[PDB]
Amino acid sequence: ARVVQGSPEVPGITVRVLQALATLLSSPHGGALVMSMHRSHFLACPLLRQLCQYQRCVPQDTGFSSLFLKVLLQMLQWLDSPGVEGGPLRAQLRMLASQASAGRRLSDVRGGLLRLAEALAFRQDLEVVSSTVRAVIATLRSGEQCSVEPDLISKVLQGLIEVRSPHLEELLTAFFSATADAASPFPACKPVVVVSSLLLQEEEPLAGGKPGADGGSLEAVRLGPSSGLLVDWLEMLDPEVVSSCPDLQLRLLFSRPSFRPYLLTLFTHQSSWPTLHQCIRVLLGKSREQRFDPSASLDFLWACIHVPRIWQGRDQRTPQKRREELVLRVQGPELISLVELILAEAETRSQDGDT
């Protein structure tokens, strides 16, 4: 009954009130036959009939489907999408279904003003899900994403992000290390729903130093909510804090923000002893450049002296109050710079007063 299938579909779409159950049963039988893969040559005929009915009537039919009978049209669209997703044999009826969905969307975007996305929402979602193709360049996508972000666009930015994610999931090529920071800053500034996925794709299989880029982003861009996410990238791909660049990490830890105590605890309980001693001797050294915050330096030193690994299982609180033996030895100029910065930072007195 493939010849009268288009007529039956048109009758059920316009006014039948009875053929809806028959169409649903036929769609269910076709889906079951496609799942069983027992020579299910029925979906192609239904797809061709639907394409012919949409090509014959595209203005009044779409309006009647989006205004009068929306439930049956949405159910038929869902069944067609399920059949196209299950029966993936060389994507025979996939192109025709995509073309029909695009034609229906183009007809409903101008002729359906009152019923705004009432029944065409499923078709739009299916078209957006089917448009997630893979880029064939994987090198110039960063410039396109930056242009879309600068042009203040939402759908274009989402499409660019999806294309970049698909290119990253595909065969990795020589990625650029120039516009990646700008793209990350734009995605952090603008409301991006796939910002975490984009960051993971850009820092998963890139041929560059993602740690320096993440540090520069966290130090320059004012990312409010996503900052913590960057903090994750500071503890996932960077085991030691002072591992790649000491100056930038020292400036990020001790400066002239919000994630400061967490990173301080990480550097205290996750760094090796030579690196810790090096940081202590370079921080407490004689330097008037104000390259270290004493407010964090004091409790950093207090935590390094009271590391729980230094006191593993000895008796609790049994020292000699006359003189402490276990101490941290320092040098002359080191202690001089320490007392200098201590007496210097204790002169602000914004609201503390005198006591």
Binding site: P239, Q270, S271, W273, R309, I310, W311, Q312, G313, E325
Partner: protein, 292 residues
Amino acid sequence: IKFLIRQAQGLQQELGGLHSALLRLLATNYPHLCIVDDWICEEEITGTDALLRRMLLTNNAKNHSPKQLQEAFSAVPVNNTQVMQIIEHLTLLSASELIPYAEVLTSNMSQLLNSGVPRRILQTVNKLWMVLNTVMPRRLWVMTVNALQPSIKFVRQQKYTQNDLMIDPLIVLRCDQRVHRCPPLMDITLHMLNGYLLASKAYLSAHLKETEQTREELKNALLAAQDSAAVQILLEICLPTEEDNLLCNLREVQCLICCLLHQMYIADPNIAKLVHFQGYPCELLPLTVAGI
């Protein structure tokens, strides 16, 4: 037998006398497995347990077969970016899915402390060994003994299966000697040393019953001398160098050794007297008194 003990203790409604008799036999035949500090960390603390397991195991822990971690360990890119997050994301398991990962964790602990390694990786390896000590601890101890080898290009004694290792636990103290400046590996070796000392005590107690088909005083003297030798070796490990004293791996290792010595003295108050009658260098006197 430890996995069976755990899965029998997990079923307390049924299996009335079976689990009871199994535990009463484990407490007598295998005293080296009934160590309290070995399987006490599995108790609830604040309910935060299994929370990160239910909230951080859906998007990952699905394509991390042991072969991937194995090939990530040994490679020209010896960078610790991927292996770190890989070994960190699998710490949320229920200590029963780490059985295929135990073989990958072992045989690479000696290669771990080669040069320039971070601190979090060693801590995660120690935590994994601790959560893998609650199940199949004997095979894990054997694998860790066979993994921590001097690697001097010549094979002297290999694989230490169950006899040449449980007879004299001192083999756990003749390792690569590079783990002495490594707090996590040192704690692992101390746990193995205590377990193997208890296992040797049990083995001698069982062997003096399967013979002559006095000897008890000889066994007691041998056990006392073995404990004293272990304590002396642990004390000599606390020496600084061969030629800061507060902020270094030496401090943490000395503290762990003092903790193990305190546990041994609490277990038996006679080995302390025997060690003091044997004596040790004075450089360790202000450390043991203020540490034990």
